[PDB]
Amino acid sequence: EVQLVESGGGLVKPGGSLRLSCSASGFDFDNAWMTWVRQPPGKGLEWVGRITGPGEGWSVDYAAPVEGRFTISRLNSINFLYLEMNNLRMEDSGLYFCARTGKYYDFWSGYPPGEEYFQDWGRGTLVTVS
Amino acid sequence: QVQLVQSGGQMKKPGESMRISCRASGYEFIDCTLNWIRLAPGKRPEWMGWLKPRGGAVNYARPLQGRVTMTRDVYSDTAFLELRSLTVDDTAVYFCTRGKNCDYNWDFEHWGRGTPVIV
Amino acid sequence: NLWVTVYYGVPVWKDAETTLFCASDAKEKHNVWATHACVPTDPNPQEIHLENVIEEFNMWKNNMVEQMHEDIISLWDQSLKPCVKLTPLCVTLQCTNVTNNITGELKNCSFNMTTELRDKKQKVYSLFYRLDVVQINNKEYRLINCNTSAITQACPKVSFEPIPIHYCAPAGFAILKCKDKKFNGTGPCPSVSTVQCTHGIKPVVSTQLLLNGSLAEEEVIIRSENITNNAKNILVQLNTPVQINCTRPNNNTVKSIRIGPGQAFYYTGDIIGDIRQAHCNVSKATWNETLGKVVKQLRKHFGNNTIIRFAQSSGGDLEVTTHSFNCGGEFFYCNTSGLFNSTWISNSNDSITLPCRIKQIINMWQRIGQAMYAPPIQGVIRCVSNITGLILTRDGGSTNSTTETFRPGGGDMRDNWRSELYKYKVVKIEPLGVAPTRCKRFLGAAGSTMGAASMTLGIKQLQARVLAVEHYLRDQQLLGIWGCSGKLICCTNVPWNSSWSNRDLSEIWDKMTWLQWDKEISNYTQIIYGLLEESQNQQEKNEQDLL
Amino acid sequence: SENITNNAKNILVQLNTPVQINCTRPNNNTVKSIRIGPGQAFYYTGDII
Amino acid sequence: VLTQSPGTLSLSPGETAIISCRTSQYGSLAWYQQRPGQAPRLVIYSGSTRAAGIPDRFSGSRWGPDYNLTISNLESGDFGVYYCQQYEFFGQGTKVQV
Ligand SMILES: *[C@@H]1O[C@H](CO)[C@@H](O[C@@H]2O[C@H](CO)[C@@H](O[C@@H]3O[C@H](CO)[C@@H](O)[C@H](O[C@H]4O[C@H](CO)[C@@H](O)[C@H](O)[C@@H]4O)[C@@H]3O)[C@H](O)[C@H]2NC(C)=O)[C@H](O)[C@H]1NC(C)=O
Ligand SMILES: *[C@@H]1O[C@H](CO)[C@@H](O[C@@H]2O[C@H](CO)[C@@H](O[C@@H]3O[C@H](CO)[C@@H](O)[C@H](O)[C@@H]3O)[C@H](O)[C@H]2NC(C)=O)[C@H](O)[C@H]1NC(C)=O
Ligand SMILES: *[C@@H]1O[C@H](CO)[C@@H](O)[C@H](O)[C@H]1NC(C)=O
Ligand SMILES: *[C@@H]1O[C@H](CO)[C@@H](O)[C@H](O)[C@H]1NC(C)=O
Ligand SMILES: *[C@@H]1O[C@H](CO)[C@@H](O)[C@H](O)[C@H]1NC(C)=O
Ligand SMILES: *[C@@H]1O[C@H](CO)[C@@H](O)[C@H](O)[C@H]1NC(C)=O
Ligand SMILES: *[C@@H]1O[C@H](CO)[C@@H](O)[C@H](O)[C@H]1NC(C)=O
Ligand SMILES: *[C@@H]1O[C@H](CO)[C@@H](O)[C@H](O)[C@H]1NC(C)=O
Ligand SMILES: *[C@@H]1O[C@H](CO)[C@@H](O)[C@H](O)[C@H]1NC(C)=O
Ligand SMILES: *[C@@H]1O[C@H](CO)[C@@H](O)[C@H](O)[C@H]1NC(C)=O
Ligand SMILES: *[C@@H]1O[C@H](CO)[C@@H](O)[C@H](O)[C@H]1NC(C)=O
Ligand SMILES: *[C@@H]1O[C@H](CO)[C@@H](O)[C@H](O)[C@H]1NC(C)=O
Ligand SMILES: *[C@@H]1O[C@H](CO)[C@@H](O)[C@H](O)[C@H]1NC(C)=O
Secondary structure, three states: OOOOOEOOEEOOOOOOOEEEEOOOEOOOOOOOOOOOEOOOOOOEEEEEEEOHHHOOOOOEEEEOOOOOOOOEEEEHHHHHHHEEEEEEOOOOEOOEEEEEEEOOOOOOOOOOOOOOOOEEEOOOOOEEOO | OOEEEEEEEOOOOOOOOOEEEEEEEOOOEEEEEEEEEEEOOOOEEEEEEEEEEEOOEEEEEEOOOEEEEEEEEOOEEEEEEEEOOOOOOOOOEEEEEEOOOEEEEEOOOOOOOOOOOOO | EEEEEEEEOOEEEEEOOOOOEEEEEOOOOOOOOOOOOOOOOOOOOOOOOOOOOOOOEEOOOOOHHHHHHHHHHHHHHHHHHHOOOHHHHOOOOOOEEEEOOOOEEOOOOEEEEEEOOOOOOEEOOOOEEEEEEEEEOOOEEEEOOOOOOOEEEEEOOOEOOOOOEEEEOOOOEEEEEEHHHHHEEEEEOOOEEEOOEEEEOOOEEOOOOOOOOOOOOOOEEEEEOOOOOOOOOEEEEEEEEEEEEOOOOOOEEEEEEEEEEOOOOOOOOEEOOOOOOEEEEEEHHHHHHHHHHHHHHHHHHHHOOOOEEEOOOOOHHHHHEEEEEEEOEEEEEEEOOOOOOEEEEEOOOEEEEEEEEOOOEEEEOOOOOEEEOOOOOOOOOOEEEEEEEEEEEEOOOOOOEEEEEEEEEEEEEEHOOOOOOEEEEEEEEEEEEEEEEEEOOOOOOOOOOOOHHHHHHOHHHHHHHHHHHHHHHHHHHHHOOHHHHHHHHEEEEOOOOOOOOOOOOOOOOHHHOHHHHHHHHOOOOHHHHOOHHHHHHHHHHOOOOOO | OOOOOOEEEEEEEEOOOOOOOOOOOOOEEEEEEEEEEOOOEEEEEEEEE | OOOOOEEEEEOOOOOEEEEEEEEEOOOOOOEEEEEOOOEEEEEOOOOEEEEEOOOOOOOOOOOOOOEEEEEEOOOOOOOEEEEEEEEOOOOOOOEEEO
């Protein structure tokens, strides 16, 4: 039972900034690395970014529209995944999801970096810009 | 030590006027409110008014407005009550009272000896 | 599982009483209300609006008002200290009426007075108001405050004009202010902000009607510690001003004589024109509309079928029964029986003229054995001011009357400044906190839950700065003994006991603010301070670092 | 005491058992108050009853 | 606004006396005792708290607007006249006799 209660964000002008938090309890936050994704309301899920494993670089990789816009951080001491989203545009909206990324690879069909999967997600947190 | 030394005891006829006094002691007279209470046998105890020194502000009970006056001497620390026109109904013992903790006036911990007035 | 972690800079504040320093704007250093020692003010005060947070205010019990009252009295006495003593003025005055030359407020009051040399006396003709002069026992009088107290002359150049005075808290303290427009003095305030200095508060002295000051924003606001209590004064704040002009028609020429080495007694020489009478004007329609608004608000606290009756003050000395104020250096006392004369049943361009008397012997903040002589001001005086508040008192004492009578009442002078400091509450800052965490070695975001806040994050002035320094070192001293020489965050080696209110760490850092957490572990705090003491650091630093 | 044998040096004696001493002024003084100036008042023994 | 239990209550020494005062308005309620030929005393204040110097026998309160004063084990110094104050009001006044 990996509860992922993500709670943050709300109404904001087209230009602005805000600060979403994604709690997590019931697994090993200390090395397993996590991802954010965005699902605008009239749209499906779209990938945002993901912290890398502590010891696996501890870096972040943004997405094609989001690069230069968002920033991801983790305070593993308190099991919290923060996402700062700044310099906002109007398409930025939806039930922003935080999930626990995984590492998957195998030989035979091996190819770097392989693939990852989003097993345990959160419930959701609505953010809408105006 | 808080002591309200009350003084009076004068027999009066109807239609005349009366005055009684209440000297404060122990506590600083200036920074604490005084009240005047009347007790008649077989009747409700009626609160007659209150007097705040440091300005001498007065609040008279509505039934007695126009007939009761309360003043004070700051230097002798003495409050004075006066009634302009007594009647038979004014037969009662009058008390000069102080709140237990003036912050809240309506706890009459300290009472005077009592001044009977017969009409 | 969980370990005590020491966070410094947590946004947790606790109420408190402290010292506060004046901070004026620019300053002729002749203002009675200027100490010529108040630090310059901030041109851009750092007013920080908070996130969602409710703060329980109580304007009736804060120490800002008591401290301001003490400061005002001390400042006035300081101003009056280096001025003439008027000891030899208490003499037998032989007074005659100021007549029409053919046909009793003013009195001539000739008298003998001392001069530069003690071997000589001079005969001086003056003019004193009837209020200042009391008859002895052959038309012989004296000044009213001679058989008690001693009258001190105000220095002629000292001006009594109110000046804005900001009150600033020392470092380590802050001043929360409630911005809720309908706030009525007590209870929760959802809209809280923080400042270092209050806005400029004019020390305006008035008794029945509060002048100038600050107005309500939306509607007339009624404040009382208990509206049903007959002893607590009701403070009314107006959302619009009612202009109150006032004048002293008399063309009054002042003359001065020397009464001793380096001392001069200023007194009214004479009057050129007709004597006339001092008076004030209040717009009739505006005052009637204001009373209508006050009745509309008062009907909410009481029954909606109650007849609200306004009457004159029922008694007291001249400061309470009459609207007492300062104008151009003179002291007016106006009847105001024409303003509160009405009954209001539960469903143009005329001016109400209030007679006013002038008193030179003044006793403000009524004290046993002290008084002032306000010297007369030459020429005609006019003022223009805003009535922005009232002080009312209920009569009570009847159950079947069905009508509530509201009379003006001066009450206490502190009631003036309660109408100005109702917004503010002083809070001590306690930046230190402890929390459970899985590591073993400004006031913004107070309303934001923990975790998000973690990454998001004259003589009075001297005592004030010194205290802060001590407090600063105190925190550092704690950080010294906890093996945390750094700042902000440090992990420590004391495990979290389950008995210390445990939510399992998923909720405390998501759902709960720093203030709530402090409330949760306040009673237990000295225990963790005990365990985080150098008892742990003796095991960690003395036993293990002697190679 | 400081050096004991030294004169010119007070010897402080502290008792284990207190000795009760009681004083009185048996005069029923009637005290009057008179004003000597503005505010200032002088208190003197008026009479002896 | 204020009413009380019967004013001719008569008990011997030793029993428990129940004095009921009903109040219409909100406010702190105090209980006063008047001895014969002496000024009243504050017996209870703020509804339930005893005044200084009052024994523990005088106690009692009620959440609702019907306050009850309980006087257990009456002595000779009791058996005065009891009043119930709420702000200015005092009520009818009930005597306790033998
Ligand atoms: C509420 O605020 C109002 C508005 O500020 C305030 O009215 C103002 O009062 C002051 C003080 O009386 C007035 O300033 C005076 O105005 C005239 C201008 O001709 C001068 O006579 C005065 O200067 C003389 O006095 C000074 C000492 O105070 C001396 O230094 C000087 O040399 C002169 O002898 C003085 O400047 C001001 O004009 C009014 N404002 C208006 C708009 O009329 C009012 O007093 C405040 N309320 C209360 C209760 O005080
Ligand atoms: C005037 O003074 C009173 C007492 O000092 C202030 O508080 C009031 O106190 C009474 C109890 O004495 C409260 O009664 C409460 O009522 C409800 C009943 O459902 C319930 O919540 C409680 O159990 C309790 O019995 C009363 O509510 C309380 N008044 C308020 C407004 O909270 C009173 O507030 C003062 N009046 C004012 C400010 O207008
Ligand atoms: C002053 O006027 C009063 C009131 O009319 C009068 O009684 C008094 O005698 C007058 N004084 C003198 C000295 O004429
Ligand atoms: C006061 O008396 C003197 C006596 O010389 C006189 O000159 C002066 O005019 C009088 N004042 C008034 C206002 O009448
Ligand atoms: C002033 O003193 C002189 C001394 O001769 C005396 O005659 C006169 O009456 C005194 N005047 C007053 C007004 O007291
Ligand atoms: C003397 O002072 C007292 C107060 O100490 C005051 O009541 C009295 O009125 C004064 N005397 C006269 C004659 O006014
Ligand atoms: C006014 O005071 C009452 C208690 O008397 C309180 O419940 C109320 O919240 C206050 N009004 C506001 C707007 O806070
Ligand atoms: C006060 O006087 C000004 C002119 O100085 C005038 O415009 C205003 O109407 C007056 N106020 C009242 C209430 O009459
Ligand atoms: C004030 O207005 C009320 C209605 O609000 C009216 O009945 C009353 O006559 C007015 N009073 C004056 C003095 O104009
Ligand atoms: C105000 O005028 C009324 C008119 O009846 C009068 O009774 C009252 O005494 C006056 N106030 C003062 C303080 O003289
Ligand atoms: C007072 O009267 C004198 C007479 O010379 C005149 O010069 C002066 O202007 C008057 N003052 C005022 C303020 O009208
Ligand atoms: C009265 O209030 C108005 C509105 O706030 C303001 O513009 C005006 O300056 C005030 N009057 C004075 C004399 O301060
Ligand atoms: C105090 O008494 C001791 C013995 O108890 C003695 O040796 C010492 O000299 C005395 N102190 C003096 C004389 O100051």
